Every structure is written in structure tokens, then in C-alpha cells.
Amino acid sequence: QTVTEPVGSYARAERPQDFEGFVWRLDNDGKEALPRNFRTSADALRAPEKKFHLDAAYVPSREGMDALHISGSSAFTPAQLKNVAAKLREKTAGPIYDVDLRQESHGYLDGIPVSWYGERDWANLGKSQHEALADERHRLHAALHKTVYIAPLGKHKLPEGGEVRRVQKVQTEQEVAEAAGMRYFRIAATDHVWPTPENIDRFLAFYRTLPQDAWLHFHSEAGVGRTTAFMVMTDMLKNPSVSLKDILYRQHEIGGFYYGEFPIKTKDKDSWKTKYYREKIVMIEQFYRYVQENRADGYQTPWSVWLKSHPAKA
Amino acid sequence: QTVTEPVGSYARAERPQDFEGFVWRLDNDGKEALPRNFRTSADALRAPEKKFHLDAAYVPSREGMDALHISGSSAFTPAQLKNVAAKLREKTAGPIYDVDLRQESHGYLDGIPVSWYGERDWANLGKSQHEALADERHRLHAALHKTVYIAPLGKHKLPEGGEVRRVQKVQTEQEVAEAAGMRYFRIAATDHVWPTPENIDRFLAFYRTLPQDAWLHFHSEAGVGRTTAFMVMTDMLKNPSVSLKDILYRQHEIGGFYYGEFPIKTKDKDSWKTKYYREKIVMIEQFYRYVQENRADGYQTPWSVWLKSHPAKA
Ligand SMILES: O=P(O)(O)O[C@H]1[C@H](O)[C@@H](OP(=O)(O)O)[C@H](OP(=O)(O)O)[C@@H](OP(=O)(O)O)[C@H]1O
Numbered sequence: 001q002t003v004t005e006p007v008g009s010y011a012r013a014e015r016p017q018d019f020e021g022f023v024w025r026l027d028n029d030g031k032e033a034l035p036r037n038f039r040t041s042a043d044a045l046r047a048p049e050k051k052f053h054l055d056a057a058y059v060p061s062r063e064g065m066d067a068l069h070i071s072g073s074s075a076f077t078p079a080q081l082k083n084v085a086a087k088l089r090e091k092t093a094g095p096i097y098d099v100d101l102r103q104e105s106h107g108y109l110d111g112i113p114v115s116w117y118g119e120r121d122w123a124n125l126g127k128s129q130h131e132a133l134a135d136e137r138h139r140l141h142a143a144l145h146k147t148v149y150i151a152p153l154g155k156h157k158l159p160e161g162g163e164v165r166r167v168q169k170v171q172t173e174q175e176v177a178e179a180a181g182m183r184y185f186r187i188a189a190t191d192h193v194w195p196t197p198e199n200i201d202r203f204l205a206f207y208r209t210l211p212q213d214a215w216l217h218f219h220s221e222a223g224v225g226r227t228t229a230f231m232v233m234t235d236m237l238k239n240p241s242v243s244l245k246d247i248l249y250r251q252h253e254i255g256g257f258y259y260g261e262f263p264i265k266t267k268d269k270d271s272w273k274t275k276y277y278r279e280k281i282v283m284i285e286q287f288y289r290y291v292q293e294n295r296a297d298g299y300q301t302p303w304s305v306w307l308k309s310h311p312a313k314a
Numbered sequence: 315q316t317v318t319e320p321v322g323s324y325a326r327a328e329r330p331q332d333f334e335g336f337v338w339r340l341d342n343d344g345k346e347a348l349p350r351n352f353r354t355s356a357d358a359l360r361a362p363e364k365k366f367h368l369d370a371a372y373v374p375s376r377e378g379m380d381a382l383h384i385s386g387s388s389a390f391t392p393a394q395l396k397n398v399a400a401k402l403r404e405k406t407a408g409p410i411y412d413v414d415l416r417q418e419s420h421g422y423l424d425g426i427p428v429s430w431y432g433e434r435d436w437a438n439l440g441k442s443q444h445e446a447l448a449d450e451r452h453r454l455h456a457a458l459h460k461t462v463y464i465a466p467l468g469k470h471k472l473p474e475g476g477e478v479r480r481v482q483k484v485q486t487e488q489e490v491a492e493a494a495g496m497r498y499f500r501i502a503a504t505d506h507v508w509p510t511p512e513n514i515d516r517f518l519a520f521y522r523t524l525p526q527d528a529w530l531h532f533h534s535e536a537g538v539g540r541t542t543a544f545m546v547m548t549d550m551l552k553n554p555s556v557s558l559k560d561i562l563y564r565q566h567e568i569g570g571f572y573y574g575e576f577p578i579k580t581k582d583k584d585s586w587k588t589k590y591y592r593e594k595i596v597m598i599e600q601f602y603r604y605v606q607e608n609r610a611d612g613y614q615t616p617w618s619v620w621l622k623s624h625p626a627k628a
Pocket residue numbers: 120121191192220221222223224225226227273
């Protein structure tokens with residue numbers, strides 16, 4: 001019997017036309033030297049956050065963490081990114097990658113990091129990566145020499161204050177990454193939800209081509225959901241002997257999200273998120289299974305293919 | 315010697331490109347039965363507002379006020395305008411005109427009164443009436459079936475909260491006026507400043523075509539600056555034997571601005587308004603003089619022509 005949307009693909013049921021972009025959102029006010037939630041795999045573990053009801057006494061294995069060479073953060077200003085790159089260059093002599101996980105169209109107007117925000121940050125929901133990047137390219141270019149309104153989100157994810165300017169310079173994140181001495185790689189993943197099979201296939205192929213000394217700096221809007229997902233996936237790929245529990249604990253304890261089971265709770269206005277949290281918990285487990293069952297033969301079978309013959313259970 | 319901009323035309327010095335529109339502003343939240351600052355010329359006089367430092371004991375002549383047949387208000391929802399029309403129909407059997415004094419592009423999206431707001435509300439500054447109305451038509455059409463953000467302005471005259479919707483219906487104010495049983499006449503007057511010689515020439519020519527029993531409902535955004543200026547001008551035209559002081563007092567005391575001399579005191583942020591207030595005071599006197607000198611012969615020469623040979627003094 002037909003299943004319309006399998007586990008891992010719940011977001012496909014949502015209607016993109018209901019979340020179209022309406023404002024240039026300020027992604028970072030540029031006040032700090034670094035982006036928020038900045039963390040590397042070299043960092044010491046800290047106490048787990050109370051909301052996840054984890055075992056504070058637990059001491060996760062650090063097997064492979066010194067060699068892992070990844071980091072994560074929120075969005076950043078160009079200056080903040082140069083600070084990130086200088087900081088990482090101290091840890092490695094390999095190429096440093098800015099891995100941009102944002103599906104939403106974003107860039108820099110007069111050096112100000114902005115994104116084209118629709119409700120739930122789903123302005124590019126349902127678009128292929130090709131379409132998402134075309135929207136981004138067109139929108140950014142159309143802003144040049146035009147008057148724009150750039151605002152942070154306040155009460156209820158609506159604009160609050162902000163500023164108005166006639167734009168004199170437009171840049172993509174790629175341009176800003178390269179100016180900072182980083183290589184650039186884009187995975188257009190949708191905010192709030194599990195990355196698509198497409199997203200993950202693209203990441204995996206990318207991962208297989210990296211030189212051994214590559215450092216991956218993942219980032220999304222806040223450096224939480226999407227950033228932690230790919231940091232976790234990378235940790236599993238590179239350190240397949242480490243237990244799922246150790247992976248989840250250690251990626252949370254250096255400053256990420258915890259992607260295991262926990263007592264979920266939402267303000268009723270945030271109750272749409274609940275099923276996306278469960279979905280992510282299940283898919284993390286399914287990806288761990290993929291890594292275990294496909295690493296012997298060197299990942300001959302792509303995630304998307306394997307997932308269709310080995311579907312996840314709600 | 316060459317004067318670049320004569321008195322009455324100061325706003326011509328400003329650069330339109332510095333005030334381009336950036337948001338659909340909510341013009342009325344629709345919560346009251348009537349628009350704000352609603353008043354008719356049949357209304358009782360109230361005590362003057364203290365900020366104008368007037369003589370609270372002075373009683374201006376009411377000569378001609380019963381026959382004047384004018385009103386003013388802020389912008390309105392379609393339902394509010396029907397309440398206005400109903401209220402006015404009780405007072406007259408003549409044609410009731412909606413005299414729209416707004417240069418800013420405005421209309422109704424799903425019945426919601428909005429305007430395309432640039433800084434200082436100068437998004438159509440410098441445009442001819444033809445160009446302003448074209449901008450308006452094009453912007454309104456372009457909104458149909460599109461996602462828009464509609465916000466009230468809060469602190470700093472920047473968007474605060476508001477709403478996002480996909481628009482199923484678009485209307486011009488003319489359509490809304492006619493649906494309420496009102497005739498429609500548009501004068502594209504710039505917010506905050508004295509109406510241009512073009513604006514006034516157009517109004518005077520319109521005035522001369524009116525039947526005796528015509529009722530004029532003037533409105534602008536708040537129903538203060540522009541609305542009162544045209545109410546005052548109409549009062550002078552129709553009641554030319556009444557003293558200038560009496561005109562100014564009585565239009566203020568039924569609920570309009572006071573267009574005579576008063577001690578101006580601005581917030582530091584509002585100091586740009588000071589010379590425009592002073593300009594309006596001088597031009598109101600100059601218009602009174604035009605009426606006194608040209609009424610006997612039936613206005614053979616228009617305001618714009620007379621003003622050029624009788625320039626106002628700063
Ligand atoms: O950008 P990444 O790093 O993926 O992180 C996201 C963003 O911070 C989201 O905020 P925004 O939507 O403003 O970008 C936030 O949603 P809320 O701010 O609605 O909580 C997500 O939390 P949850 O979706 O709640 O898990 C969080 O995982």
C-alpha cells in the first residue's frame with residue numbers, strides 16, 4: 001500500500017507557497033568577534049544541558065576526536081568569518097572548508113549578513129538546490145543600488161526595528177568565504193528538519209573527495225539543528241567504531257544539539273516542531289546503521305538508494 | 315539674483331532617492347467604527363490645544379460654517395469609509411466627494427488599507443501626479459496573488475510586528491470610495507510639507523466645477539497636516555469675508571491643525587520639520603492674500619502664476 005511520504009521526508013508534505021519570503025532578515029548583528037555557538041572537535045566536553053535529561057556522570061569516549069577536524073557555528077559577518085578562519089588555521093595546515101548548510105537564500109548587502117526570510121524560514125522549501133541557488137543569485141543581484149529593509153526578528157518571528165539602506169555592494173557567501181581563505185561548499189538544507197536524501201548524497205560524495213587533512217567548518221543560521229546534524233554524520237563516518245551514544249553525547253557536550261531521545265516539550269505555538277524532532281531522532285539512528293552496514297565495501301551504495309530499500313520506522 | 319527654490323517649494327531641494335519605499339505600512343487597524351481625527355464643519359468648537367498657545371477665551375466668527383459642508387479624517391478601512399459616508403449623507407443630499415490628498419502610493423490589499431512607505435513617507439517625492447499614480451497602480455497590481463508583509467510603524471518609524479499574507483484581492487481607493495457611494499478626487503500632496511502650486515492649481519480648478527451642495531471629505535494619512543491645509547483653503551475660498559484669524563482658529567477648534575504662528579518645539583529627531591512648519595505658516599497667509607486679491611474678478615489668473623509674480627517671504 002502506497003506511503004506518500006516516508007520517514008526522513010515529512011517536510012515534503014508542507015506547502016511551499018505558504019512560506020514565501022517577505023523580508024531581508026539580519027543573520028548576525030556583528031557585535032561579537034565570533035559567530036554564536038562556535039565550537040571545534042578539539043574542545044573539552046562540558047556538562048550536558050538539563051533539558052536533554054542526560055547522564056551528567058557519563059564520560060564519553062574521545063576516540064578519534066583529535067583527528068576529526070570539524071567545527072560549527074551560526075551565521076557570521078565577513079569580519080567574524082576571518083576570525084574563525086584565523087582561529088582554525090592555528091589547528092591545521094590543510095584546506096579549510098566553509099560548509100554552508102543553508103537552503104534559504106542568503107548573502108551580504110554592504111557586508112551585512114542577510115537572508116530572505118519566509119515563515120518558519122521556509123522561503124526555499126521544496127526547491128532543488130539548483131532552484132534555491134538561482135533564487136539567491138537573482139535576489140542578491142536585484143538588491144544592488146536598490147533600497148532595502150533589513151531587520152532582526154523579534155516578537156513572533158516578525159521584523160522589529162532594523163534599518164533601511166540603498167545597497168552599494170552585494171556578495172555571495174562563496175565570495176566572502178574565499179576572501180577569508182576558505183574553500184566553499186553548499187548543501188541547501190531546510191531549516192528545522194532532517195536533511196533530505198539529496199542533501200546527504202551530496203555531502204557523502206563531497207566527503208569521499210576530501211584530502212586527509214581537510215578541516216570542515218559547518219554552519220547554518222544559528223549553528224544548532226543543521227550544523228549539529230552534519231557534525232554528527234561526519235563523526236560517524238570518520239569514527240565508525242565509536243558507539244552511537246558516545247557520538248551523540250560528545251557532539252552535544254562540545255556545544256551542539258543532542259540528537260538522541262529526550263523528553264520533548266514545546267510552547268503550543270511551537271508544537272509543529274514536535275514531529276520533526278522525532279523524525280530527526282529516528283533518522284540519526286538510521287544513518288548510523290547506514291554507516292555500519294556500508295563502510296566495509298567503501299559506500300558503494302548511496303544513502304538515498306540504501307534508504308529506499310531500508311526505510312526507517314516512525 | 316537667482317533663487318533656487320522659492321518659499322512654498324522648499325521640499326524640491328530634497329533628494330527623492332534618499333526616501334524610497336521599503337514596506338507596506340498599515341494605515342488603519344480597523345478597530346474603531348470611524349477613522350481618526352474625524353470632524354465636520356458643523357461641529358461645535360472645542361478648547362484649543364495647549365501646544366499652539368492660543369487665546370482660549372477668543373470666540374471666532376462662525377459666519378459661513380453651517381454652509382461650508384466639509385469634513386476631514388485619517389485614512390480608513392472600507393467599512394470605516396462607509397460609516398463616514400452614512401454619517402455625511404445625513405447632513406446633505408448633494409454629492410459627497412472623497413478628496414484623497416495622499417501623494418504616497420496606497421490602496422487596499424484584502425480590504426486592508428496600506429501605503430508604500432519610504433522614510434518620512436516620501437516614497438513618491440518629486441514625482442508628477444501622473445508618475446505617482448502609475449507607481450501606485452503598478453505596485454498594487456503586482457501584489458495580487460503574492461506574499462506581502464504589512465506592518466504598523468512603531469519606534470523610529472520602523473516596522474513593528476504586523477502580518478504576512480498572500481493577497482487575493484487588490485483595490486484602489488477610488489474603487490473603495492465609489493463602493494461607499496462617494497465621488498473621488500485625488501490630489502497627490504507630499505506628507506509634511508506645503509502643497510505644491512500644481513496641487514493647489516488642481517484643487518482650485520476642481521473647486522470651480524463643484525455644485526453648490528457638494529460636500530468635501532478631505533483625508534490624508536493622519537488627517538492632520540494636509541487635510542487641515544485644504545480645509546482651511548476651502549474655508550477661505552467659500553467664506554472670503556471671514557478674518558484669517560477666525561478661519562485658522564475655527565478649523566483648529568473643530569479638530570484640525572492650527573496653521574497660524576505658534577512657538578515651535580521639536581524633538582531633536584524632528585528638527586527637520588521646523589522649516590516646513592514655518593513655510594506653511596507663511597504660505598497660508600500668502601494663499602489668503604491670493605483669495606482676497608483675485609476673487610472679485612473670478613480668478614482669471616491661477617495660484618501658480620500669481621505666486622510667481624507675488625513671491626512669499628521666508
Ligand atoms: O539554523 P540551524 O542551526 O539549523 O538552527 C535552527 C534555527 O536556530 C531555528 O531558528 P530560525 O527558524 O529563527 O532560523 C530554530 O527554530 P526556532 O527559533 O523556531 O526554535 C531551530 O530550532 P528548532 O527548529 O526549534 O529545533 C534551530 O535548530
